[PDB]
């Protein structure tokens, strides 16, 4: 169809603008980790939870590995 590929376009655009937003705010998250986090917040989830987890998981490979 047309509106089914325009729906597939409307995520691909937003994932590209959020990729600019990710580097200008200087996170350690790349595009691959970003895609999981955008699926989680597509369902709806506390970002306050996700922030504390990633502050620990990133701290779980620079002093435990």
């Amino acid at each position: 169809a047309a509106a089914a590929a325009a729906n597939l376009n409307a995520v691909r655009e937003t994932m590209d603008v959020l990729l600019e937003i990710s580097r200008i705010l200087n996170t350690g998250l790349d595009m691959e980790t970003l895609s999981i986090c955008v699926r989680l917040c597509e369902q709806g989830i506390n970002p306050e939870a996700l922030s504390s987890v990633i502050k620990e998981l990133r701290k779980a490979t620079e002093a435990l590995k």
């Binding site: 603008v17 580097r23 705010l25 987890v53 490979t61």
Partner: protein, 107 residues
Amino acid sequence: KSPNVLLQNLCCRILGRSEADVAQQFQYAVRVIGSNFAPTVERDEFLVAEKIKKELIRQRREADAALFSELHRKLHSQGVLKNKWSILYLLLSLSEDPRRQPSKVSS
């Protein structure tokens, strides 16, 4: 996908470790996500947009503070998302100091 196994996929992207090598990291993910399982937080994305613009003025790059404004408009312009607030709150909270940002490609 179910969210519980999605946490373990996240743990194998962030850390190079497999999902059968450790279970403690996944257990901490279950510890925080569980008993917070449903969304209960409130969004005020207006205030957080106004707080990103003050930060981009603080870099003393003022052309890029208004380029973000037009890129922030586009997320509402498409509007296929759940909350615009959530991923932006996550991405603001994890900030490090680029000291003033010695470059930006601007797409």
